[model samples]
Target: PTHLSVDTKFKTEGLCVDIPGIPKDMTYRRLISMMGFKMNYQVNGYPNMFITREEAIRHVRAWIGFDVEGCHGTNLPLQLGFSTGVNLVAVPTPLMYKGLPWNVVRIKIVQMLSDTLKNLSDRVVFVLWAHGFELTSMKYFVKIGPERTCCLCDRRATCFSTASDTYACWHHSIGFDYVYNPFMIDVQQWGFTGNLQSNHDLYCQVHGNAHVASCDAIMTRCLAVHECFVKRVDWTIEYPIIGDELKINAACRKVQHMVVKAALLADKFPVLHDIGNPKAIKCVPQADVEWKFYDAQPCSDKAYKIEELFYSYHSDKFTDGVCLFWNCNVDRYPANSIVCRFDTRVLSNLNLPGCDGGSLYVNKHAFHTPAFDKSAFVNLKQLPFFYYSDSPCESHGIDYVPLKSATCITRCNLGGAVCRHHANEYRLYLDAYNMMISAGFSLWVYKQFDTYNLWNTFT
Candidate 1:
């Protein structure tokens, strides 16, 4: 039962962060490191009160949220919404602009209804991969025709109808489209659960004119800002941990991951607030959400699986720039093998429910030179997806805890089943995560200081 308000939890409440002296390229530790008593870890150990608030507000204008509507097969575009937090604009498919957006729905109606990527600027600051569906659909549809040029990047696009490139319909792939303008910021990848419907429903009720696109665009704009802000804040303030001490941080994180994994492997996993009965609902305290009006929508567990199979399962990686079949899985997902420090990955129901070991990656993202989307966290969030079953938990109920506060791991890195069902138990485990983070970090900091003093005595 998340007691936090939806607005605060999703960060839609304090949306704008554009002010002077903001932490644009600064972090709490960065600022603290430069303060007069800078080098002293003790003084810096005191957390800065305004770090989180300052971080999101600074990027308020950097992103313009977008939402696209597409049905399942060959998924043609239905409608599109681009938002700047406060204002939203709907750019319908090829209804008005034939070549402007893309495709004629194949029906001329379908072709006409197929694309609206044209109305988008050549530079879309950022976008959330509505659980990979946005990226999946974005890539599954929209391709170049005989016109061999990109809609945004100025790169060459292979012509779907064969402008003579040694292949048939190879260019017809969503693989050839370069609406790469909008870099993705997969918000749910945050691992902290918040109901977008809560914000959407409220916004529509207040606006009176009734709509999903408008509210979705706006809700997402704020949501991404918070997720990205918190993610950076969680890891970036690492000025507190110098070289050898980082090994300690990773060691502590390993233990935290183990506990989280152990806790979730049984039948009485997280929480189970299945939505039908008052008695069943009463099994747990009522969630802050209005269950009668907004029950939990089915998780995109399957949607993510399908996304992996067709899009990422088999794609040529060597030719990303060719605008051909070199890279069909446009949304970069990392290898799901275990590199375990603090882990989080989507798993499928391998025949039954409950946790089957999840996935991990190298301890850091900076290790990759081909950093994703001009953002540090994009590839880390998008990559590393697998399938196992938390179906029992979903059939029961789940929980959530705000990870925006102190964490044992990355702020967005909530491990295993808890993130998906996010019922009440996570609210319980989170404080322990926080405790381990602070305690380990504090001890490691003091160890360096004590070791320095010992060296002074020896000298």
Candidate 2:
């Protein structure tokens, strides 16, 4: 699981330099000289760490136990949490931490000393991929050999070759709506026993790297395209390799087309969690209210879909805004941030299950956003953060170490999966179809169907 936590204490007293552990003689210039090469390699290596300055800052914040403070960090941590999955990235912090706060600086020193006292007697190799997306370049590296090879790739391995002269095959997989692939690509599914290594590891893209297996865009493109194609069409002859250069070329063209389409589709949707525009908007009340004993009652079995909620309150722009206002209020309470109260009087008069005990009293003055009643939102939690957790052994190029350390969910890149429910209903559903489906029904069933189709339609 991704570790997300807050330091509570401002450990880093706030200098821009390395926090702890380094010799006083170490300066930013020297530290950069010593580690810049590794940083390049970490991101440029096999399973890369492709990120922007903002993304890198978010990551550095989590490593220091900040839990994604509203602001990103000032500097990168000396050593990051080790990730043993794709490739290994073990960095010594003393090399980076120099002139900084006593608190964070000491923490860095302690961690560095621990590394020195620890054992590297048995080290597993890892391939790393580091990318400076802002720079539009990727770095690939393999850690097995003493001299790590960090090569830079300009585009998505569109034309990868082991020796520079030979052209290889690569395939791109795309999922329509949200369900990408329940299993392997039909075209590339190896039905034999030794197909995949373990649970978390799958597909030619990753498996190829596992045994130091090699295949370029040509091979991968062919496999993925064939797999996706076979799912749609049936070809009788399995053309095993011969001097079928013409057939191979044709396949390459087809693969390229499919890949481009998938890329286009992905760009259009912009998959991540919570922050994107959702097909159906969910109104999770982040605010709270008090209720007179007899005024409150049980809420009914009314199931409303998110879109229904959107439309129901859309007419009066200020109406939805008001509800959102109350929502933002409840979020202020630590215990109530996850759940809150809503005005059931509209439905309460209808005798709902949970609305007759006491009438909800929304604090009129509680609306606090700068926009206030002007906008259609009450602005709860500035931004909702989300994340995905994989064994460190999964993704490449992370320097997270093997033992125990925290990784804040909200502190990573903006693309992982954010748990916040927003406009992107399809992605949430795809993650775990059944689970997301159930959540959809429980929270926004009324919104999913047409207004005329709801019980309120006839009444």
Candidate 3:
């Protein structure tokens, strides 16, 4: 490992760290607010937002070494209780969520205190010494609530009572997108089990009477199994059910060994090891290609560069057929223009018997031209027949090019061609079409538009 030198100026007690874009001398509360402004806009609020207000305040209390009003004790007595052969200290307050308070009822105080020290030594700054009274007043943190406010959006919440709340909000859910600590453990993996009344009771019981080391051991193994269970159940809140005492004991023994084998480096960082220690923690990469691609523009103008090349072929010869009625009702035809592609047979099929075919553009100078808006004509009418076919006789050739060129709004109708942007329109049309067909359309008609489901299903 490379040696990291701390700035000499920061080695002192009153050292300050200034963010580049933020002002110096910012208050703690304002700092949190500013942090929210920057962080909430991106990955939601992240780790800070993932936790409860009380948990956040407790963290601040631990770091800044301050006591909350009406809150007493240091974390020391529990530590002493863990180390001493005789238990002496009372257990601390359980972790709180919202305004609800929970007691650490299952685990022994001294044992948890001992476990806490090993789990936190490297990650936290601890006081070297405290008197007996100071240790007695120390507190323990335990989150107790049925709802989890999103760390990022801070809008939607994952409620324990609602599966959809968590599943629907997976993008903003803690573990699904953002995670904290070296373990890279998601709140989903840790949250539900942590919030479950049963697990809460179990942990509380352990913290009160169980050996501190054993408390950590139980959490490490069982919490791992719970985490594994959430994955197996697909990030859901269904806790695994143990059938019998024998199976439960067997599972615990097997899981304990698995935890040991998995955490081979526990001996190095004794504290972190029993509590899901972190050997190496990696952050989400700055260049997260997947996220980048997800948020990228669906279609860039760069791909439409081919439009310029195709338009290069725009000329008097090609701008024939239906374009005459649309673009030049009676305007000047280019001197070298050929006769209109619609001859007697084509004119008969058009059902415009009373209209003079000669009026289209036959004798060029023989017809008086009418002034018209060329741009409006081009905008309102479809591309000419020549764009889709080269045959003098109206035999339609492969029409892919023009169909792809037309926007989605116009194509996908009257046998129009499909474009890259057609997927969205196809979905919308398919839904409407399916509803109409289901109402009473014949099987033949229904089957004709059945192609829509294939497109809609993927979306």
Candidate 4:
């Protein structure tokens, strides 16, 4: 390890550094608004919208971070929970569509539940229903409630049965939870990577350059995997302009050309051992290359350098919150992109398509283009997993697969606060978990936020 310089300026707190080209709304959303400003009108046909996808993505790459190849704690408590836990809305659709498969939904739910409860460290139950038919659907978040607090007396009281007057005059004051209306989405299938053959320099090149750590560290981990993998899968989620529910699907496909190349190199190497702790590897070179290839463009941008994008810096209070917003629309950026965010959950007697009673719920919302305002996105009109067919019965069907070997897999998804910014960045940070619980679900009962089952299931 390198020694610290004797004259280094450590712990320089309160060094206020104003962001370049950033405005003063002091929120992620406001910052996006500034970034969305079109530099100049298009002369030749290419709409001179705000910044280029390259700039947007590069901006993210230099600031945000994404663990595409799966990382530890990805699906924490659920994989740990008995272990863990974990959406949708829309209009009344006569032509009901099939929901995502239960098995697939399980994985996504694990991720969401892990994310929702990890910070709270609470025990959460994950549920879902799988419908095999290929159709359209949507997702929603809620916080179950039963009690209200009093103002006069600093005490908690059950309020579901009591009226506002009764809840109030109980010698206490009362407040209300401004629940967010069920945010909607169109559900669809998820298509992830399989396998392939092509390059032999994967270790020396791509994986080594990923954002998580150094090339040496990445190579060290790859050597440990009995059989390494790098594949590409297509996925999508579709929603209707008319209603809240949409469609989602997942297809497990192989990016033959890309995978083959990486596999060729990995197949020859021995599983490396104990170079260092898996968590502490600083593979900036490897991360950079990985960011370039993995489609993290929405996070990477020319306007900002790589240093500001990926690595986590607790010293910078705004770092974690700001990066997440830009990373959503990765396709527009030059680096890696996020095809979709697959979040799943369970419902009691909710009439979702593709399942009978107590069905596994799957909601796949694809990469959104831009919102009606033409700056960012909310949801997708059509998902990427399955092709739309004229006949519902004839439409293609998909199978959700579980990594049988990974008997206990924990996935995770998280929500946080969003502050207002200027034109550069719009929706800065989002507190989905708090928003969900406040909507209708009792987060306390659903899963305590600080302490929860992190891993469940044993051989």
Indicate which candidate wins on lDDT: 1
**Per-candidate count of clashing residue pairs (backbone under 3 Å):** 25, 86, 35, 156
Q: Flag regions of model 3 displaced more than 4 Å.
A: 1-190, 193-197, 200-213, 229-459
* Local lDDT at 350 for model 4: 17
Candidate 4 C-alpha lDDT tens digits along 329-410:
2222111111222111223111111111111121232121211121122221211111111111221312322222111111
TM-score of each: 0.24, 0.19, 0.14, 0.15
Evaluate residue 78 in candidate 4 and report its C-alpha lDDT on the 0 to 100 scale.
14
lDDT per model, in order? 0.28, 0.21, 0.23, 0.20
lDDT of 2 by residue, 35-57 (tens): 32232333222222222222222
Per-residue error for 60 in candidate 3, Å, reads 30
Instruction: Name the 10 consecutive residues with the lowest summed lDDT in model 4.
Output: 180-189
Instruction: List where candidate 4 sits over 4 angstroms from the true fold.
Output: 1-157, 160-332, 335-338, 341-383, 387-459
Q: For model 3, how does the per-residue alpha-carbon lDDT over 1-459 read when each residue is reduced to its tens digit?
A: 121111111111111211233343433334324323223333332332222222321221111111121222333123222111222333343222122222322123323332332222111112211112321132232111223454455433321112232321223332221111100111222334233224524422322324332233223333322222222222122212212323323432332332222222111111110111122221112211111100111110111121232245423232221111111121222221111111212221111111111111111011111112232222232211111111122223212233343322232332455443344333444444333223211111101122222222221
Sequence-dependent TM-score of model 2: 0.19
Query: What lDDT score is found at residue 221 in candidate 2?
Result: 29
Q: Which digits, one per residue and each the tens of the lDDT, describe model 1 over residues 1-459?
A: 211111222222111121233333433344323322222333212223112223323323234455554421132434454453222112234112222233322222112111222221122233442532233344323222232344334433322322223211112324232321122343443454445655333322322223544346555654553333322333332122212334434444443343322222211122321221122222123223211211222111111122432344312332121111111112323322111111122221110011112111112211100111222123232111111222233425233444332222221223322333333333444443443343311110001111112112111
Higher-ranked by TM-score: 2 or 3: 2
